[PDB]
Amino acid sequence: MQGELMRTVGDVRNGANAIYSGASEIATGNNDLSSRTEQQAASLEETAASME
């Protein structure tokens, strides 16, 4: 019973870390992607100003 419990704890604990680390990649991607969105919108403001 302990063998299956320790194995489950290890698989869940080690696997849970992958979700936390993997989730950080998505959060980091949104942060980096968010920066491009701000610059993307800024280009429209600068580009729209040129049309004026």
Partner: protein, 51 residues
Amino acid sequence: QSRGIDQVGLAVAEMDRVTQQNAALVEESAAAAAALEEQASRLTEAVAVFR
């Protein structure tokens, strides 16, 4: 106007290149999000012995 169109042309090229970078992050986020779906399934396999 010719100089203005040039600035607008280079601006479109900048936004066009930035758009490709955003697509890379969208696919990367989708690929990373899909990986989490697989990791969540591995958790069920470890406890597959239990209910």
